[PDB]
């Protein structure tokens, strides 16, 4: 009921985009090849870290069941509300539970894996329900994780 026949086929098709040699497992090398075609340039360690999150049996690569497991999972089923709220709290220096749109854009476009201005615009529209320019991040994180 969660996964449909068509969803499973789509995910099997996606798996083959990563599994270049067709041996049923995605390696760090194969993941690196895909990400470089997507414009990214990760390190071997970064590639290893990504596989480590998906590689349930710890054999160093991702097979289709591990891939499907990861892809069938919704953000709501990762039990991440506390971590994501804690991360927003870091930028609420005053602690009043609000971060302005301007503060969020300043941080999101200049630190870390910078968002484009368009992506921040999308985030603000999604989060600032009442349009007052202040993001109640607890409500935002609740909606993303519930």
């Amino acid at each position: 009921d969660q996964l449909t026949e068509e969803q499973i086929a789509e995910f099997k098709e996606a798996f083959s985009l990563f599994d270049k040699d067709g041996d049923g497992t995605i390696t760090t090398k194969e993941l690196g090849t895909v990400m470089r075609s997507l414009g990214q340039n990760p390190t071997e360690a970064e590639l290893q870290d990504m596989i480590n999150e998906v590689d349930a049996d710890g054999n160093g690569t991702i097979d289709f069941p591990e891939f499907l497991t990861m892809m069938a999972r919704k953000m709501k089923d990762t039990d991440s509300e506390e971590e994501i709220r804690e991360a927003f709290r870091v930028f609420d220096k005053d602690g009043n539970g609000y971060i302005s749109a301007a503060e969020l854009r300043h941080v999101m476009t200049n630190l870390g894996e910078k968002l484009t201005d368009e992506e921040v615009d999308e985030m603000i529209r999604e989060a600032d329900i009442d349009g007052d320019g202040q993001v109640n991040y607890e409500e935002f994180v609740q909606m993303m994780t519930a």
Binding site: E10, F11, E13, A14, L17, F18, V34, M35, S37, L38, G39, Q40, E46, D49, M50, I51, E53, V54, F67, M70, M71, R73, M75, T78, S80, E83, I84, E86, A87, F88, V90, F91, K93, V107, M108, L111, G112, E113, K114, L115, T116, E118, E119, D121, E122, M123, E126, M144
Partner: protein, 73 residues
Amino acid sequence: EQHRQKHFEKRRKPAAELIQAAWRYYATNPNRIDLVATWRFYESVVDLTPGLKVSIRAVCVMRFLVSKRKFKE
């Protein structure tokens, strides 16, 4: 004075990256075709899709799981 100041300095980059990865996870949801900006970002660095979109999703899920891990370290 610089009490919580040094701690903010230590947490800010993993905090931002978790928010960013979480947003890109959320904003590539196939049931929200109104959310286009994260796709336009990836589009500006790769031309259409269709199975390319699911692979981007896979990259976003994996980057979110890693950034969640790094945040709790």
